[PDB]
Amino acid sequence: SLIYQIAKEFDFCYGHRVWSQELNPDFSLDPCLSCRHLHGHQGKVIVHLESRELQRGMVTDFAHLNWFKRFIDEVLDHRFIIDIDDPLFPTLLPHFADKSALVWMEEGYARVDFERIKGESSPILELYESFVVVRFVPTSESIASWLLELLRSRIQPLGVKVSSVEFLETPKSRARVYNE
- Chain residues binding a copy of itself by CB under 8 A are 1-9, 18, 20-24, 26-30, 34-35, 54, 56-59, 61-67, 70, 136-142, 145, 148, 157-158, 169, 171-180
90 phi and psi angles, rounded to 5 deg: -70, -15
Indicate the residue among 66 and 153 with the shorter CB distance to a copy of itself.
Answer: 66
Closer by beta carbon to a copy of itself, 94 or else 157: 157
CA angle 165, 170, 172 (to 5 degrees): 95
Q: Is 121 exposed, middle or buried (0-12, 13-18, 19+ CB in 10 A)?
A: exposed
Residue 70 CA: distances (Å) to CA of 21, 74, 76, 96: 31, 6, 10, 27
Cβ count within 10 A of residue 125: 14
Task: Kindly report the number of other CB atoms within 10 A of residue 49's CB atom.
Answer: 22
Give me the least distance between CB of 79 and a copy of itself, in Å please: 18
Closest CB to a copy of itself among residues 110, 134:
134
37 labelled binding-site residue: no
CB-CB neighbours of 48 under 10 Å: 20
Complex with a copy of itself: residue 101 or 179, whichever CB lies closer:
179
> What is the closest distance, in whole angstroms, from the C-beta atom of residue 115 to a copy of itself in the complex?
30
41 is in an annotated binding site: yes
Least distance in angstroms from the C-beta of 53 to a copy of itself: 10
Is residue 95 marked as binding? no
Residue positions in the annotated binding site for Zn(2+)? 16, 39, 41
